[PDB]
Amino acid sequence: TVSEWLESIKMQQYTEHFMAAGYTAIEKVVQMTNDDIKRIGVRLPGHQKRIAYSLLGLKDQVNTV
Amino acid sequence: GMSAWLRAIGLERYEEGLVHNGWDDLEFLSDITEEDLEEAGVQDPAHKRLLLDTLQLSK
Numbered sequence: 001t002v003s004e005w006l007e008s009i010k011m012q013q014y015t016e017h018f019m020a021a022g023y024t025a026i027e028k029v030v031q032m033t034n035d036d037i038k039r040i041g042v043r044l045p046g047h048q049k050r051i052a053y054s055l056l057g058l059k060d061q062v063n064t065v
Numbered sequence: 066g067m068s069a070w071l072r073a074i075g076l077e078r079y080e081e082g083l084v085h086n087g088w089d090d091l092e093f094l095s096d097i098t099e100e101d102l103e104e105a106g107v108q109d110p111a112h113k114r115l116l117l118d119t120l121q122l123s124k
Contacts, residue, residue, distance in 0.1 A: 010087035046086025049104045 002029055005058070009050050017041040030059045067091055074119045082106045095120060 002025065006015045017040045023029045032040075037051050066089050071077045080089070083105040088094045097120075102113050 008093065010090050010093050044085040046083075046088075046104055050087045050101075053101075 002026055005029075005054065009054050011047060011050055014040070014042070014047070014051070026058065026062070030055065030062055067094055070119065070123050073123055074115060076112075076115065076119070079105075079107065079112075095124065 003015055021040045023032055034052055042048055068080060071080055086105045088097060099113050107113055
């Protein structure tokens, strides 16, 4: 679940904005590119990597049939 | 956070840098990688090695 991902990467406080931006489910979370990340409420350069890096994995993970 | 943590090694002045990346917690910072370090500004070899030392020194 999105919660486990967001909390494991210590992005706990983002879950709030994430779900609010319609990205409540993984399938939608793996869609949003880098732009969306910064828009939802990420101004920290560091968090812009913690989420992006991990997102890359998720996007690939769902592709690994 | 890792305030007193980095203090013992003399890296306290860096803290805030690893805060803007989400490593401001000894929950997952204790298992941080050398890759997830450079992003916080800790790109230097000596600095990375220093933090890795603290993982076993302070734990």
